[PDB]
Amino acid sequence: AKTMKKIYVTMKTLSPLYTGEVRREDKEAAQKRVNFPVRKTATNKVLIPFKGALRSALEIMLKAKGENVCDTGESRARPCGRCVTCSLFGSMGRAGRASVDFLISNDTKEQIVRESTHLRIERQTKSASDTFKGEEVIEGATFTATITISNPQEKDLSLIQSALKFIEENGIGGWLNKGYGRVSFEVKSEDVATDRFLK
């Protein structure tokens, strides 16, 4: 109420990282060169969606405990509005308490994005059957985000860290089964007064 919990999350990549470009025009311009462009700014810095990864982590883990969290991931499935995940990240008619920012890179695309050759090899002949260039983010690339919890509760920070420990195990972004997206999160939280700027 009178405080906000600001979780400054700094994430390093322990693996090549791919998250796909969403922007039609940028993707269409890049498919002249690379069939799988990476999601960037016009400031030329890599953007990663972060709220949905945290929500997916907490729904799978809190449903694995047996708590009555809903699933906001099926087709047509609506948030119920009574879970701890619905309180932390939102419901239809109830805005989320966590203002999860995008994972914005510290470096620019020339430093951390590399165009990479990926293949499909025929099983019998052991020869290349398909080739495709795709952009990926290098290892050791640092990304920063801020998760700003409004109306702070007790569990929240630990919940976020627990969700981060899910993303440290599985990954963030795309091509997660192939080995991509393995990352390491470091947390620096701070409880701050919501009237910090009025002075």
Partner 1 sequence: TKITFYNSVFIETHNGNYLFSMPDGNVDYLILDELIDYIERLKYTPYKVFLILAKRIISKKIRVELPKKVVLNINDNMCNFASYRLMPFSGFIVEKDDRIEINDKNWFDMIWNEEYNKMRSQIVAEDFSALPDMSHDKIIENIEYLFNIKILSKNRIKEFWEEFCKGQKAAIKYITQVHRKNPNTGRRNWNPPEGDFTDNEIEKLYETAYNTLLSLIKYDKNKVYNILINFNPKL
- Contact set with Zn ion (CB under 5 A): 70, 79-80, 83, 86
Pull the structure tokens for residue 175: 């091509």
According to the binding rule CB under 8 A, does residue 122 interact with its own copies? yes
Residues 165-184 that bind its own copies (CB under 8 A): 165-166, 169-171, 176-180, 182
Residues 194 and 123: their CA atoms lie apart, in Å, by 60
According to the binding rule CB under 8 A, does residue 37 interact with its own copies? no
Q: Give the residue, chosen from 32, 127, 154, 190, that forms a contact with its own copies under the rule CB under 8 A.
A: 127
Position of tokens 């050759």? 117
| Shortest distance (Å) from residue 106 CB to partner 1 | 6
Interface mask (CB under 8 A) for partner 1, residues 60-79, using x and -?
--------------xxxxx-
According to the binding rule CB under 8 A, does residue 110 interact with partner 1? yes
Residues 18-37 that bind partner 1 (CB under 8 A): 29, 32-33
Other CB atoms within 10 A of residue 91 CB: 18
CA-CA distances (angstroms) from residue 64 to 53, 69, 92? 16, 10, 24
For residues 47 and 146, the answer to whether their CB atoms sit within 8 Å is no
| Shortest distance (Å) from residue 56 CB to Zn ion | 13
Q: Find the distance separating the first CA and the last CA of the chain, reported in whole Å.
A: 19
Rounded to 10°, the helix 51-65/156-169 angle is 100
According to the binding rule CB under 8 A, does residue 84 interact with its own copies? no
